[PDB]
Amino acid sequence: VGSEVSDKRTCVSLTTQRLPVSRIKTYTITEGSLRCVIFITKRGLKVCCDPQATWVRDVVRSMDRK
């Protein structure tokens, strides 16, 4: 959520229950080059599948040899 609503990621957040969870944990699903992140919260869950969509050449990484 922010002061802009255009392109975040394709994530959906569904609110269910109000029962406490052990910890707000995130699960990553990786199937067929598809990532999915699940946020378990005490008021709902966020599930966000990403087919490496945001994976562009940003920043440009280069590992220092050693």
Added chain:
Amino acid sequence: VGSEVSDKRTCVSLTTQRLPVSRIKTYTITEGSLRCVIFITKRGLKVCCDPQATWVRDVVRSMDRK
């Protein structure tokens, strides 16, 4: 049988994306005393959390090898 039906599989579902998935799979979360079942589909995601209440006898799912 009729219009009386407040009982349903209490799962929250949203349809997002349209990319084919490797397998419509389910991940079952068990954190604390909370169970959750996540359906990955090629056009949506179903997250069904169960704090151990939706225990009905049907479906009969042999655990698809995660």
